[PDB]
Amino acid sequence: TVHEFAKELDATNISIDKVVGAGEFGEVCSGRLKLPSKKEISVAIKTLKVGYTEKQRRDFLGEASIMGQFDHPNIIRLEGVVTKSKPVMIVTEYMENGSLDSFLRKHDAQFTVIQLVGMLRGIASGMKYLSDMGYVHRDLAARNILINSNLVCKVSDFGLSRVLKIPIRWTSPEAIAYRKFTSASDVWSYGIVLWEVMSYGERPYWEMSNQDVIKAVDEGYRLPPPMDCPAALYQLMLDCWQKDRNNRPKFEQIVSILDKLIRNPGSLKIITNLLLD
Numbered sequence: 349t350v351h352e353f354a355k356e357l358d359a360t361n362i363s364i365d366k367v368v369g370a371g372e373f374g375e376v377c378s379g380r381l382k383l384p385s386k387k388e389i390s391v392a393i394k395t396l397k398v399g400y401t402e403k404q405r406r407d408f409l410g411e412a413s414i415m416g417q418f419d420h421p422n423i424i425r426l427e428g429v430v431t432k433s434k435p436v437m438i439v440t441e442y443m444e445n446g447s448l449d450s451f452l453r454k455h456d457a458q459f460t461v462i463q464l465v466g467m468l469r470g471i472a473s474g475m476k477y478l479s480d481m482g483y484v485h486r487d488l489a490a491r492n493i494l495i496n497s498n499l500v501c502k503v504s505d506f507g508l509s510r511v512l513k514i515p516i517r518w519t520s521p522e523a524i525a526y527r528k529f530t531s532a533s534d535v536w537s538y539g540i541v542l543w544e545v546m547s548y549g550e551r552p553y554w555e556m557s558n559q560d561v562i563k564a565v566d567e568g569y570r571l572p573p574p575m576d577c578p579a580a581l582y583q584l585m586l587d588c589w590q591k592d593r594n595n596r597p598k599f600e601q602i603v604s605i606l607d608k609l610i611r612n613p614g615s616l617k618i619i620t621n622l623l624l625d
């Protein structure tokens with residue numbers, strides 16, 4: 349049940365401002381939540397459509413029951429849910445700059461490498477905690493990361509997450525071949541996210557036929573270095589994309605690698621069709 353890991357909010361404490369998106373289960377809006385302390389915060393509010401199916405309700409709230417297990421600065425925060433009145437609602441922290449892929453596409457080549465690496469470090473830190481908690485996300489992609497007014501990136505979209513629909517472009521070869529999902533398949537996905545960020549939201553493998561994405565990666569081809577990509581970051585992508593999952597870095601190692609790059613920004617000044625790795 350969702351109440352094990354979600355607070356039931358009093359709807360009198362929720363105000364709705366405007367619609368900001370559309371989900372599988374209903375609308376997404378922005379608004380305000382008054383906390384018990386009287387503090388008021390901005391929030392995102394997702395509603396379950398009128399005339400929902402029992403399955404739609406279970407899936408909708410199930411994603412909240414996963415999210416509510418995590419309390420980490422780089423994982424979207426669940427403020428609570430409304431179930432005792434309808435529409436049913438999930439209330440999360442507000443992320444002013446929306447989904448990371450769309451945000452980067454609006455800002456091609458407009459951030460510093462250190463800004464991009466800060467975004468990537470945040471995502472890695474959230475993934476380190478998720479994987480520490482025994483969860484495999486399975487849908488780690490820039491479209492599933494939200495970014496706030498201060499450029500802090502946070503892991504979202506727990507619909508496909510499982511305790512230890514097949515987005516092929518983001519999925520490791522072993523997970524495609526026989527549904528071998530592990531934290532190491534999430535690391536592969538992270539490598540794709542790293543490519544997405546450094547490419548400012550370019551689509552991984554562009555619009556290659558899915559069968560060709562699967563075959564090419566199996567044959568050892570990899571996405572090419574994004575323009576002006578630091579060598580260190582392309583190498584990190586390649587490491588995330590090791591054929592043997594046991595050779596991929598752990599999230600903790602990724603976080604450490606990025607922290608070193610942040611501490612020695614001069615490192616990033618060495619700069620680096622699919623490439624056969």
Ligand SMILES: Nc1ncnc2c1ncn2[C@@H]1O[C@H](COP(=O)(O)OP(=O)(O)NP(=O)(O)O)[C@@H](O)[C@H]1O
Nearest residue numbers: 368369370371372376392440441442443444446447
């Ligand atoms: N916490 C949040 N803060 C601010 N905006 C949000 C938040 N959650 C979702 N949104 C906005 O709502 C949009 C859709 O929500 P999302 O979480 O992506 O659900 P979805 O079912 O995946 N819909 P879509 O991505 O459009 O297919 C996002 O792209 C954001 O622009």
Ligand SMILES: [Mg+2]
Nearest residue numbers: 447491492505
């Ligand atoms: Mg989305």
